[PDB]
Design an enzyme around this catalytic site. Structure first.
Site, short mmCIF file in Angstrom:
data_model
loop_
_atom_site.label_atom_id
_atom_site.label_comp_id
_atom_site.label_asym_id
_atom_site.label_seq_id
_atom_site.Cartn_x
_atom_site.Cartn_y
_atom_site.Cartn_z
N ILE A 23 38.94 43.53 26.43
CA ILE A 23 39.80 44.70 26.60
C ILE A 23 40.02 45.05 28.07
O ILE A 23 40.78 45.97 28.38
CB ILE A 23 39.25 45.92 25.84
CG1 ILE A 23 37.85 46.30 26.33
CG2 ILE A 23 39.27 45.66 24.33
CD1 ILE A 23 37.29 47.57 25.69
N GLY A 26 35.66 45.59 34.14
CA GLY A 26 34.93 46.60 34.87
C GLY A 26 34.82 46.21 36.34
O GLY A 26 35.48 45.30 36.82
N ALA A 27 33.95 46.93 37.05
CA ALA A 27 33.72 46.61 38.45
C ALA A 27 32.97 45.29 38.59
O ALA A 27 33.33 44.45 39.43
CB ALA A 27 32.95 47.73 39.13
N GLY A 29 32.09 43.03 35.94
CA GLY A 29 32.22 42.05 34.88
C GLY A 29 33.21 42.46 33.81
O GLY A 29 33.93 43.45 33.95
N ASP A 139 34.10 59.83 43.25
CA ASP A 139 34.94 58.68 42.92
C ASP A 139 35.99 58.94 41.85
O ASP A 139 36.48 58.00 41.22
CB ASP A 139 34.06 57.46 42.60
CG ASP A 139 34.81 56.15 42.76
OD1 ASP A 139 35.87 56.13 43.41
OD2 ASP A 139 34.33 55.13 42.22
#
Length: 324
Positions: A23, A26-27, A29, A139
């Site tokens: 889907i 990520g950062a 993986g 962030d």
């Protein structure tokens, strides 16, 4: 017969989680949707391989500790964590979270006042909880705001959070007091999100730390001299730029609720001390419909070797051991 695989990658999430499909990223993986055979729910599973960059160990460990302590419906939780039984075999870590069908960075490319009102309400409500823990997220941005079909928002990505100079992809939403922090950083980001929810574009994108600034000064113009007075080299850089004036808020957003521009105005205050606080932003007439009634010396490993961080990650992930 062996572990499931997605796009040529091992997703060794044992027998508990099956029916894997990609889907996104990520950062650190791949992210897959899965089925939790024990709790009979679909989940999101982030594969994380950080153990060879101390900064990736640092943010992974930090995020785990924060998320395992927070409990709030507008903050993503950690349902489970899968890793090897022995620290030396632990090369990967899988974080299992509620499946959110999209994030706000994706959603604003396919809004409404009723929606923006609710989203903003949920973001602030969640940030209220975060600031109430005396943590700074540091962030916030639409991609960190996951969304589901029923219009529920959850905040994620607590890698760069600290208790009351690090590269990030499109650090546009970084506050201006950062160019020289306090909880004001997040309210600024929140403001920049309300600005983008209304315009479906980030009205402060700078290709460089310098270009960024000028993208701001074109809207709140230059600041008061009492702001320059509130870093020597920094103030001097500000005194060296050609003057620019402020732009009324209904010029850039001629379709936005004046209630929104009122609250938006109170959040995009250049001065980090005049900037509205979260609990006052929830109390704003715009979010009137939904207006109803500590780590401290902890997380403090801003500089540890990647080996002891692997030790702490192991320890922190022990509460989910052993898996099914």
């Amino acid at each position: 017969a062996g572990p499931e695989m997605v796009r040529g990658q091992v997703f060794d999430v044992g027998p508990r989680y099956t029916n894997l499909s990609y889907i996104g990223e990520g950062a650190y993986g791949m992210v897959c949707s899965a089925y939790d055979n024990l709790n009979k729910v679909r989940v999101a599973i982030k594969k994380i391989s950080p153990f060879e960059h101390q900064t990736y160990c640092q943010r992974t460990l930090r995020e785990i500790k924060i998320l395992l302590r927070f409990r709030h419906e507008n903050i993503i939780g950690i349902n489970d964590i899968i890793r090897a039984p022995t620290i030396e075999q632990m090369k990967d870590v899988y974080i299992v979270q509620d499946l959110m069908e999209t994030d706000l960075y994706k959603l604003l490319k396919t809004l409404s006042n009723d929606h923006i009102c609710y989203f903003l309400y949920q973001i602030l409500r969640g940030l209220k909880y975060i600031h109430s823990a005396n943590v700074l997220h540091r962030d916030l941005k639409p991609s960190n705001l996951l969304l589901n079909t029923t219009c529920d928002l959850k905040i994620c990505d607590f890698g760069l959070a600290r208790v009351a100079t690090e590269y990030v992809a499109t650090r546009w939403y970084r506050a201006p007091e950062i160019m020289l922090y306090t909880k004001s950083i997040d309210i600024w980001s929140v403001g920049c999100i309300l600005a983008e929810m209304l315009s479906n574009r980030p009205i402060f994108p700078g290709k460089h730390y310098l270009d960024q600034l000028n993208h701001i000064l074109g809207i709140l113009g230059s600041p008061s001299q009492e702001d320059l007075n509130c870093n020597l080299k920094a103030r001097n850089y500000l005194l060296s730029l050609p003057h620019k004036n402020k732009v009324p808020w209904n010029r850039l957003f001629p379709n936005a609720d004046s209630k929104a521009l009122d609250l938006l105005d109170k959040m995009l205050t250049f001065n980090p001390h005049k900037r509205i606080e979260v609990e006052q932003a929830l109390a704003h007439p715009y979010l009137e419909q939904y207006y109803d009634p500590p780590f401290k010396f902890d997380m403090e490993l801003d500089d540890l070797p990647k080996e002891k961080l692997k030790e702490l990650i192991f320890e922190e992930t022990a509460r989910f051991q052993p898996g099914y």
